[PDB]
Design a protein around this ligand. Structure first.
Ligand SMILES: O=C(O)[C@H]1O[C@H](O[C@@H]2[C@H](O)[C@@H](O)[C@@H](O[C@@H]3[C@H](O)[C@@H](O)[C@@H](O[C@@H]4[C@H](O)[C@@H](O)[C@@H](O[C@@H]5[C@H](O)[C@@H](O)[C@@H](O)O[C@@H]5C(=O)O)O[C@@H]4C(=O)O)O[C@@H]3C(=O)O)O[C@@H]2C(=O)O)[C@H](O)[C@@H](O)[C@H]1O
Ligand SMILES: [Ca+2]
Ligand SMILES: [Ca+2]
Ligand SMILES: [Ca+2]
Length: 399
Protein backbone atom coordinates (compact mmCIF):
# COMPACT_ATOMS: atom_id res chain seq x y z
CA UNK A 1 0.00 0.00 0.00
CA UNK A 2 1.05 3.64 -0.50
CA UNK A 3 1.78 6.08 2.36
CA UNK A 4 -1.82 7.26 2.28
CA UNK A 5 -3.16 3.76 2.88
CA UNK A 6 -0.52 2.19 5.14
CA UNK A 7 -1.33 1.53 8.79
CA UNK A 8 0.90 1.43 11.86
CA UNK A 9 2.36 -2.09 12.15
CA UNK A 10 0.76 -4.27 14.86
CA UNK A 11 4.03 -4.32 16.86
CA UNK A 12 5.17 -0.77 16.17
CA UNK A 13 5.17 1.01 19.55
CA UNK A 14 2.41 2.21 21.90
CA UNK A 15 0.39 3.47 18.91
CA UNK A 16 -0.32 -0.19 18.05
CA UNK A 17 -2.04 -0.90 21.40
CA UNK A 18 -5.64 -2.23 21.46
CA UNK A 19 -7.51 -0.94 18.38
CA UNK A 20 -4.20 0.32 16.94
CA UNK A 21 -3.56 3.14 14.50
CA UNK A 22 -5.13 2.71 11.08
CA UNK A 23 -5.83 6.42 10.41
CA UNK A 24 -7.91 6.87 7.26
CA UNK A 25 -6.67 3.71 5.51
CA UNK A 26 -10.28 2.51 5.06
CA UNK A 27 -11.38 5.74 3.32
CA UNK A 28 -13.93 5.48 0.53
CA UNK A 29 -13.35 7.28 -2.78
CA UNK A 30 -15.12 10.53 -1.84
CA UNK A 31 -12.98 10.87 1.33
CA UNK A 32 -9.55 11.00 -0.34
CA UNK A 33 -8.29 14.57 -0.81
CA UNK A 34 -5.29 16.28 -2.33
CA UNK A 35 -4.58 19.70 -0.83
CA UNK A 36 -2.11 22.46 -1.71
CA UNK A 37 -3.22 25.44 0.39
CA UNK A 38 -4.87 26.36 3.70
CA UNK A 39 -8.38 26.60 2.20
CA UNK A 40 -8.18 23.11 0.70
CA UNK A 41 -6.66 21.65 3.88
CA UNK A 42 -9.33 23.16 6.16
CA UNK A 43 -12.09 21.99 3.78
CA UNK A 44 -10.69 18.43 3.72
CA UNK A 45 -10.33 18.26 7.51
CA UNK A 46 -13.81 19.64 8.15
CA UNK A 47 -15.12 19.62 11.71
CA UNK A 48 -14.87 17.17 14.63
CA UNK A 49 -17.96 15.45 13.17
CA UNK A 50 -15.88 14.43 10.13
CA UNK A 51 -15.09 10.98 11.56
CA UNK A 52 -15.33 8.93 8.34
CA UNK A 53 -11.98 7.42 7.39
CA UNK A 54 -10.19 10.01 5.24
CA UNK A 55 -6.84 10.40 3.50
CA UNK A 56 -5.32 13.79 2.84
CA UNK A 57 -2.32 14.12 0.53
CA UNK A 58 -0.42 17.38 0.96
CA UNK A 59 1.01 18.69 -2.30
CA UNK A 60 3.78 21.30 -1.97
CA UNK A 61 3.92 24.09 0.63
CA UNK A 62 0.93 25.02 2.79
CA UNK A 63 1.35 28.40 4.50
CA UNK A 64 -1.11 28.62 7.39
CA UNK A 65 -0.58 32.34 8.03
CA UNK A 66 -2.92 33.37 5.21
CA UNK A 67 -6.42 34.85 4.88
CA UNK A 68 -9.36 33.24 3.02
CA UNK A 69 -7.93 34.44 -0.31
CA UNK A 70 -4.52 32.94 0.58
CA UNK A 71 -2.95 36.38 1.10
CA UNK A 72 -0.04 36.19 3.60
CA UNK A 73 -0.80 37.57 7.07
CA UNK A 74 1.74 39.04 9.48
CA UNK A 75 2.08 40.92 12.78
CA UNK A 76 0.09 43.98 11.69
CA UNK A 77 -2.76 41.86 10.33
CA UNK A 78 -3.23 39.99 13.62
CA UNK A 79 -2.50 42.89 16.00
CA UNK A 80 -5.33 44.13 18.23
CA UNK A 81 -5.75 47.94 17.75
CA UNK A 82 -4.65 48.47 21.39
CA UNK A 83 -1.53 46.28 21.25
CA UNK A 84 1.88 47.92 20.85
CA UNK A 85 5.17 46.09 21.46
CA UNK A 86 6.98 49.26 22.67
CA UNK A 87 4.21 49.87 25.19
CA UNK A 88 3.97 46.20 26.18
CA UNK A 89 7.72 46.25 26.90
CA UNK A 90 7.46 49.55 28.81
CA UNK A 91 4.49 48.32 30.86
CA UNK A 92 6.09 45.07 32.06
CA UNK A 93 9.80 45.98 32.38
CA UNK A 94 10.94 44.27 35.64
CA UNK A 95 12.66 47.61 36.47
CA UNK A 96 9.29 49.35 36.91
CA UNK A 97 6.71 46.52 36.93
CA UNK A 98 8.58 44.19 39.28
CA UNK A 99 7.88 40.46 39.18
CA UNK A 100 4.06 40.48 39.35
CA UNK A 101 2.11 38.88 36.48
CA UNK A 102 1.54 41.17 33.46
CA UNK A 103 -2.01 42.52 33.59
CA UNK A 104 -3.87 45.60 32.40
CA UNK A 105 -4.22 47.10 28.94
CA UNK A 106 -1.20 45.83 26.99
CA UNK A 107 -1.35 42.22 28.25
CA UNK A 108 -5.11 42.05 27.53
CA UNK A 109 -4.45 43.46 24.03
CA UNK A 110 -1.60 40.97 23.50
CA UNK A 111 -3.91 38.08 24.47
CA UNK A 112 -6.55 39.25 21.97
CA UNK A 113 -3.85 39.56 19.28
CA UNK A 114 -2.71 36.00 19.98
CA UNK A 115 -6.28 34.64 19.59
CA UNK A 116 -6.48 36.36 16.18
CA UNK A 117 -3.47 34.40 14.89
CA UNK A 118 -4.62 31.18 16.62
CA UNK A 119 -7.77 31.32 14.47
CA UNK A 120 -5.66 30.98 11.30
CA UNK A 121 -2.71 28.77 12.32
CA UNK A 122 -4.35 26.19 14.58
CA UNK A 123 -6.50 23.40 13.16
CA UNK A 124 -7.96 20.24 14.75
CA UNK A 125 -7.44 16.85 13.08
CA UNK A 126 -10.60 14.73 13.23
CA UNK A 127 -10.81 11.00 14.05
CA UNK A 128 -9.74 8.34 11.53
CA UNK A 129 -7.47 10.57 9.44
CA UNK A 130 -4.28 9.96 7.50
CA UNK A 131 -2.38 13.06 6.41
CA UNK A 132 0.68 12.42 4.27
CA UNK A 133 3.06 14.44 2.12
CA UNK A 134 3.10 13.63 -1.59
CA UNK A 135 6.66 13.54 -2.94
CA UNK A 136 9.69 14.92 -1.13
CA UNK A 137 8.69 18.58 -0.68
CA UNK A 138 5.39 18.59 1.25
CA UNK A 139 5.51 21.38 3.84
CA UNK A 140 3.27 22.93 6.48
CA UNK A 141 4.54 26.42 7.37
CA UNK A 142 3.37 28.34 10.44
CA UNK A 143 0.79 25.65 11.22
CA UNK A 144 -0.20 23.98 14.49
CA UNK A 145 -2.03 20.68 13.99
CA UNK A 146 -3.95 19.71 17.11
CA UNK A 147 -5.06 16.13 17.71
CA UNK A 148 -7.76 15.61 20.34
CA UNK A 149 -9.30 12.67 18.48
CA UNK A 150 -8.53 8.96 18.07
CA UNK A 151 -6.76 7.20 15.20
CA UNK A 152 -4.57 9.66 13.30
CA UNK A 153 -1.54 9.14 11.06
CA UNK A 154 0.78 11.97 9.97
CA UNK A 155 3.71 11.16 7.66
CA UNK A 156 6.26 12.58 5.22
CA UNK A 157 5.68 16.28 5.94
CA UNK A 158 8.16 19.02 6.81
CA UNK A 159 6.67 21.17 9.59
CA UNK A 160 8.31 24.59 9.70
CA UNK A 161 8.23 27.53 12.04
CA UNK A 162 5.10 27.38 14.22
CA UNK A 163 5.56 31.08 14.93
CA UNK A 164 3.74 33.21 17.50
CA UNK A 165 3.72 36.95 16.73
CA UNK A 166 2.76 37.69 20.36
CA UNK A 167 5.05 36.03 22.94
CA UNK A 168 3.91 36.53 26.54
CA UNK A 169 6.26 37.74 29.27
CA UNK A 170 6.35 35.71 32.48
CA UNK A 171 8.65 37.38 35.07
CA UNK A 172 8.51 34.33 37.37
CA UNK A 173 9.18 31.65 34.75
CA UNK A 174 12.67 30.85 36.01
CA UNK A 175 14.92 33.10 38.12
CA UNK A 176 15.11 35.85 35.45
CA UNK A 177 11.72 35.26 33.76
CA UNK A 178 10.96 33.98 30.25
CA UNK A 179 9.00 34.76 27.11
CA UNK A 180 6.53 31.99 26.22
CA UNK A 181 4.68 31.28 22.96
CA UNK A 182 1.72 29.08 22.11
CA UNK A 183 2.19 27.11 18.86
CA UNK A 184 3.66 23.64 18.42
CA UNK A 185 3.98 21.96 15.04
CA UNK A 186 1.76 19.17 16.41
CA UNK A 187 -0.06 19.23 19.75
CA UNK A 188 -1.60 15.98 20.95
CA UNK A 189 -4.30 17.23 23.32
CA UNK A 190 -5.94 14.12 24.74
CA UNK A 191 -5.37 12.41 21.37
CA UNK A 192 -5.07 8.62 21.23
CA UNK A 193 -3.78 6.06 18.69
CA UNK A 194 -1.50 8.38 16.76
CA UNK A 195 1.42 7.71 14.44
CA UNK A 196 3.81 10.55 13.51
CA UNK A 197 6.40 9.10 11.13
CA UNK A 198 9.01 10.36 8.65
CA UNK A 199 8.23 14.01 9.39
CA UNK A 200 10.67 16.88 9.76
CA UNK A 201 10.31 19.59 12.42
CA UNK A 202 12.31 22.81 12.36
CA UNK A 203 12.12 26.58 12.85
CA UNK A 204 12.19 27.30 9.09
CA UNK A 205 13.60 30.67 8.03
CA UNK A 206 13.12 32.25 11.46
CA UNK A 207 15.39 30.41 13.90
CA UNK A 208 15.67 31.72 17.48
CA UNK A 209 19.01 33.34 16.52
CA UNK A 210 16.98 35.95 14.61
CA UNK A 211 14.99 37.04 17.67
CA UNK A 212 16.26 39.81 19.97
CA UNK A 213 16.50 39.61 23.77
CA UNK A 214 14.08 41.70 25.83
CA UNK A 215 14.72 42.03 29.56
CA UNK A 216 17.83 39.91 28.86
CA UNK A 217 15.65 36.97 27.78
CA UNK A 218 15.14 35.57 24.27
CA UNK A 219 11.95 36.93 22.67
CA UNK A 220 10.78 33.38 22.02
CA UNK A 221 8.37 32.98 19.08
CA UNK A 222 8.25 29.15 19.18
CA UNK A 223 6.65 26.52 21.50
CA UNK A 224 7.13 22.79 20.96
CA UNK A 225 7.51 20.51 17.98
CA UNK A 226 5.54 17.45 19.06
CA UNK A 227 3.96 17.93 22.51
CA UNK A 228 1.48 15.59 24.21
CA UNK A 229 -0.88 16.56 27.04
CA UNK A 230 -4.16 15.96 28.91
CA UNK A 231 -4.35 12.16 28.87
CA UNK A 232 -2.82 11.73 25.40
CA UNK A 233 -2.20 7.99 25.01
CA UNK A 234 -1.03 5.21 22.64
CA UNK A 235 1.32 7.12 20.36
CA UNK A 236 4.24 6.13 18.13
CA UNK A 237 6.65 8.77 16.80
CA UNK A 238 9.21 7.23 14.47
CA UNK A 239 11.83 8.24 11.88
CA UNK A 240 11.26 11.96 12.46
CA UNK A 241 13.94 14.62 12.03
CA UNK A 242 13.79 17.34 14.67
CA UNK A 243 16.37 20.08 14.12
CA UNK A 244 17.28 23.67 14.96
CA UNK A 245 14.72 24.27 17.70
CA UNK A 246 14.68 24.95 21.46
CA UNK A 247 11.96 22.94 23.28
CA UNK A 248 11.12 19.84 21.23
CA UNK A 249 8.80 17.37 22.91
CA UNK A 250 7.02 17.89 26.20
CA UNK A 251 4.88 14.92 27.27
CA UNK A 252 2.69 15.81 30.24
CA UNK A 253 2.14 19.54 30.64
CA UNK A 254 1.84 19.83 34.45
CA UNK A 255 2.99 18.23 37.71
CA UNK A 256 -0.59 18.90 38.93
CA UNK A 257 -2.25 16.83 36.17
CA UNK A 258 -2.05 13.55 38.09
CA UNK A 259 -4.75 12.19 35.77
CA UNK A 260 -1.86 11.79 33.29
CA UNK A 261 -0.64 8.88 35.45
CA UNK A 262 -1.19 5.60 33.56
CA UNK A 263 -1.42 7.59 30.32
CA UNK A 264 1.11 9.33 27.99
CA UNK A 265 2.11 5.91 26.67
CA UNK A 266 4.39 6.98 23.84
CA UNK A 267 7.08 5.24 21.78
CA UNK A 268 9.89 7.27 20.25
CA UNK A 269 12.18 5.40 17.88
CA UNK A 270 14.62 6.17 15.06
CA UNK A 271 14.19 9.92 15.54
CA UNK A 272 16.99 12.41 14.90
CA UNK A 273 17.50 15.43 17.14
CA UNK A 274 20.11 17.82 15.72
CA UNK A 275 20.74 21.21 17.36
CA UNK A 276 17.82 20.73 19.74
CA UNK A 277 18.28 22.53 23.06
CA UNK A 278 16.07 20.50 25.38
CA UNK A 279 13.05 18.26 26.04
CA UNK A 280 13.72 15.36 23.69
CA UNK A 281 11.54 14.27 25.39
CA UNK A 282 10.68 15.92 28.70
CA UNK A 283 8.30 13.50 30.43
CA UNK A 284 5.88 13.66 33.35
CA UNK A 285 4.02 10.47 34.44
CA UNK A 286 4.16 8.47 31.19
CA UNK A 287 5.57 5.06 30.28
CA UNK A 288 7.67 6.31 27.38
CA UNK A 289 9.78 3.94 25.28
CA UNK A 290 12.77 5.76 23.79
CA UNK A 291 14.89 3.57 21.52
CA UNK A 292 17.34 3.85 18.61
CA UNK A 293 17.23 7.66 18.59
CA UNK A 294 20.22 9.80 17.60
CA UNK A 295 21.04 13.08 19.33
CA UNK A 296 23.68 15.48 18.00
CA UNK A 297 24.55 18.98 19.17
CA UNK A 298 27.00 21.33 20.84
CA UNK A 299 26.89 22.96 24.26
CA UNK A 300 28.72 25.95 22.71
CA UNK A 301 26.45 26.48 19.67
CA UNK A 302 25.55 30.12 18.94
CA UNK A 303 21.98 29.29 17.86
CA UNK A 304 20.64 26.18 19.63
CA UNK A 305 23.09 25.02 22.32
CA UNK A 306 22.48 21.54 23.76
CA UNK A 307 21.14 21.53 27.34
CA UNK A 308 19.80 17.97 27.85
CA UNK A 309 18.24 15.07 25.92
CA UNK A 310 15.83 13.33 28.31
CA UNK A 311 13.77 15.22 30.89
CA UNK A 312 13.08 13.05 33.93
CA UNK A 313 9.99 14.89 35.15
CA UNK A 314 7.51 14.08 37.90
CA UNK A 315 6.72 10.35 38.13
CA UNK A 316 8.16 9.74 34.63
CA UNK A 317 8.74 6.14 33.57
CA UNK A 318 11.19 6.41 30.65
CA UNK A 319 12.48 3.10 29.26
CA UNK A 320 15.49 3.88 27.06
CA UNK A 321 17.34 1.40 24.82
CA UNK A 322 20.29 1.80 22.44
CA UNK A 323 20.19 5.57 21.97
CA UNK A 324 23.22 7.49 20.75
CA UNK A 325 24.19 10.96 21.96
CA UNK A 326 26.94 12.98 20.24
CA UNK A 327 27.68 16.17 22.21
CA UNK A 328 31.40 17.02 22.69
CA UNK A 329 32.52 17.50 26.31
CA UNK A 330 29.19 16.40 27.80
CA UNK A 331 29.38 14.22 30.92
CA UNK A 332 27.30 11.05 31.37
CA UNK A 333 25.16 12.75 34.04
CA UNK A 334 24.36 15.79 31.88
CA UNK A 335 22.70 13.76 29.11
CA UNK A 336 19.53 14.15 31.18
CA UNK A 337 17.83 16.74 33.38
CA UNK A 338 16.06 15.50 36.54
CA UNK A 339 13.12 17.57 37.83
CA UNK A 340 11.37 17.33 41.21
CA UNK A 341 9.39 14.10 41.47
CA UNK A 342 11.61 12.35 38.90
CA UNK A 343 13.28 9.36 40.59
CA UNK A 344 13.57 6.58 37.99
CA UNK A 345 14.98 5.92 34.54
CA UNK A 346 15.74 2.70 32.76
CA UNK A 347 18.50 3.12 30.16
CA UNK A 348 20.53 0.42 28.46
CA UNK A 349 23.02 0.68 25.61
CA UNK A 350 23.32 4.47 25.85
CA UNK A 351 26.33 5.67 23.85
CA UNK A 352 27.74 9.08 24.67
CA UNK A 353 30.44 10.27 22.27
CA UNK A 354 31.14 6.63 21.35
CA UNK A 355 31.41 5.43 24.96
CA UNK A 356 28.86 3.21 26.69
CA UNK A 357 27.32 5.02 29.69
CA UNK A 358 24.61 4.51 32.33
CA UNK A 359 22.63 7.79 32.43
CA UNK A 360 20.34 6.60 35.21
CA UNK A 361 23.16 5.52 37.58
CA UNK A 362 25.15 8.70 36.80
CA UNK A 363 22.19 10.62 38.21
CA UNK A 364 21.48 8.37 41.21
CA UNK A 365 18.10 7.37 39.79
CA UNK A 366 16.43 3.99 40.32
CA UNK A 367 16.69 1.75 37.23
CA UNK A 368 13.21 0.39 37.93
CA UNK A 369 10.40 2.07 35.97
CA UNK A 370 7.91 -0.77 36.59
CA UNK A 371 7.36 -1.85 32.98
CA UNK A 372 8.98 -3.38 29.90
CA UNK A 373 7.75 -2.47 26.39
CA UNK A 374 6.28 -5.43 24.47
CA UNK A 375 5.23 -3.46 21.39
CA UNK A 376 8.39 -2.71 19.41
CA UNK A 377 10.01 -3.67 16.13
CA UNK A 378 13.60 -4.83 15.80
CA UNK A 379 16.15 -3.05 17.99
CA UNK A 380 19.32 -1.82 16.27
CA UNK A 381 22.63 -2.26 18.04
CA UNK A 382 23.75 1.16 19.34
CA UNK A 383 26.72 0.90 16.95
CA UNK A 384 24.37 1.29 13.94
CA UNK A 385 21.91 3.88 15.26
CA UNK A 386 23.73 7.00 13.99
CA UNK A 387 23.97 5.66 10.41
CA UNK A 388 20.44 4.24 10.31
CA UNK A 389 18.85 7.39 11.74
CA UNK A 390 20.77 9.92 9.59
CA UNK A 391 20.04 7.86 6.45
CA UNK A 392 16.36 7.24 7.22
CA UNK A 393 14.85 9.90 9.53
CA UNK A 394 12.75 12.80 8.25
CA UNK A 395 10.50 13.94 5.42
CA UNK A 396 11.51 13.27 1.80
CA UNK A 397 13.13 9.92 2.68
CA UNK A 398 10.24 7.81 1.34
CA UNK A 399 7.66 9.74 -0.82
O1 LIG B 1 -6.65 27.59 25.75
C1 LIG B 1 -5.76 26.91 25.20
O2 LIG B 1 -5.30 27.19 24.07
C2 LIG B 1 -5.20 25.72 25.93
O3 LIG B 1 -5.28 25.93 27.34
C3 LIG B 1 -4.75 24.87 28.14
O4 LIG B 1 -3.32 24.69 28.13
C4 LIG B 1 -2.20 25.26 28.81
C5 LIG B 1 -1.41 26.17 27.87
O5 LIG B 1 -2.29 27.07 27.19
C6 LIG B 1 -0.63 25.37 26.82
O6 LIG B 1 0.23 26.23 26.07
C7 LIG B 1 0.18 24.27 27.50
O7 LIG B 1 1.40 24.75 28.09
C8 LIG B 1 2.18 23.89 28.95
C9 LIG B 1 2.52 24.65 30.23
O8 LIG B 1 1.35 25.14 30.89
C10 LIG B 1 3.46 25.83 29.95
O9 LIG B 1 3.93 26.39 31.18
C11 LIG B 1 4.65 25.35 29.12
O10 LIG B 1 5.50 24.40 29.79
C12 LIG B 1 6.78 23.80 29.56
C13 LIG B 1 7.10 22.94 30.78
O11 LIG B 1 6.06 21.97 30.98
C14 LIG B 1 7.24 23.84 32.02
O12 LIG B 1 7.79 23.11 33.12
C15 LIG B 1 8.17 25.02 31.73
O13 LIG B 1 9.55 24.68 31.49
C16 LIG B 1 10.59 25.19 32.34
C17 LIG B 1 11.06 26.57 31.86
O14 LIG B 1 9.97 27.48 31.67
C18 LIG B 1 11.83 26.46 30.56
O15 LIG B 1 12.39 27.74 30.23
C19 LIG B 1 12.97 25.45 30.69
O16 LIG B 1 13.94 25.94 31.62
O17 LIG B 1 12.45 24.18 31.13
C20 LIG B 1 11.73 24.17 32.37
C21 LIG B 1 11.15 22.80 32.57
O18 LIG B 1 11.38 21.92 31.72
O19 LIG B 1 10.45 22.59 33.58
O20 LIG B 1 7.84 25.71 30.52
C22 LIG B 1 7.86 24.86 29.37
C23 LIG B 1 7.75 25.69 28.11
O21 LIG B 1 7.38 25.13 27.05
O22 LIG B 1 8.06 26.90 28.15
O23 LIG B 1 4.24 24.62 27.97
C24 LIG B 1 3.45 23.45 28.23
C25 LIG B 1 3.17 22.83 26.91
O24 LIG B 1 3.28 23.58 25.91
O25 LIG B 1 2.86 21.62 26.85
O26 LIG B 1 -0.68 23.43 28.27
C26 LIG B 1 -1.33 24.12 29.36
C27 LIG B 1 -2.16 23.14 30.15
O27 LIG B 1 -2.54 23.48 31.29
O28 LIG B 1 -2.42 22.03 29.64
C28 LIG B 1 -5.50 23.57 27.88
O29 LIG B 1 -4.89 22.49 28.59
C29 LIG B 1 -5.54 23.24 26.38
O30 LIG B 1 -6.45 22.15 26.17
C30 LIG B 1 -5.95 24.44 25.52
O31 LIG B 1 -7.37 24.64 25.62
CA1 LIG C 1 8.28 28.27 30.01
CA1 LIG D 1 4.89 25.25 25.83
CA1 LIG E 1 3.56 23.42 23.38
Amino acid sequence: ADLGHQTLGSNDGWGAYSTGTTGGSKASSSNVYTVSNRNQLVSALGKETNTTPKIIYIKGTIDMNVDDNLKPLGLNDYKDPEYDLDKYLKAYDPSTWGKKEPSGTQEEARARSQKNQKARVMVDIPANTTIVGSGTNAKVVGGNFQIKSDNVIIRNIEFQDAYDYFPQWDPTDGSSGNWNSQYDNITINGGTHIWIDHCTFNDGSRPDSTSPKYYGRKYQHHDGQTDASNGANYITMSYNYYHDHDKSSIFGSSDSKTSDDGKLKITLHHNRYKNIVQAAPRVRFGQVHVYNNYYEGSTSSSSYPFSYAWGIGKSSKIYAQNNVIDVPGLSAAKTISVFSGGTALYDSGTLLNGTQINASAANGLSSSVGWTPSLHGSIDASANVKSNVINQAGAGKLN
